[PDB]
């Protein structure tokens, strides 16, 4: 599929996952999250076939978690934040 794989070794215009790393406080404005202090979550750009009216768009697909550290008080907890990771892209 349009996943890093396929798309990180041949980087070109076509619609394609593309890194992308985010930072929880500076981009998501986020402090509650201990560990990390960030992740990459990749996205999706690039050209799909062209039409008239109505043409596709480079979207995200498959997502995955991202295993998180965070503290409700002193207590520790680890917890998969669901569809943070762009997994791979299709055109829509």
């Given at each position: 599929a349009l996943d890093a794989a396929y798309c990180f070794r041949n980087v070109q215009d076509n619609c394609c996952?593309?890194?992308?790393y985010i930072d929880?406080?500076?981009?998501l404005g986020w402090k509650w999250i201990?560990?990390?202090k960030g992740y990459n979550?990749?996205?999706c750009a690039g050209a799909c076939p062209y039409r008239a009216s109505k043409s596709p768009s480079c979207v995200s697909q498959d997502?995955?978690?991202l295993t998180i550290l965070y503290y409700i008080g002193?207590?520790?907890?680890?917890?998969?934040l669901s569809n943070?990771?762009?997994k791979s892209c299709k055109c829509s």
């Open positions: 996952l593309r890194p992308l929880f406080k500076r981009d201990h560990e990390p979550a990749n996205f997502l995955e978690p002193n207590t520790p907890k680890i917890e998969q943070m990771i762009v």
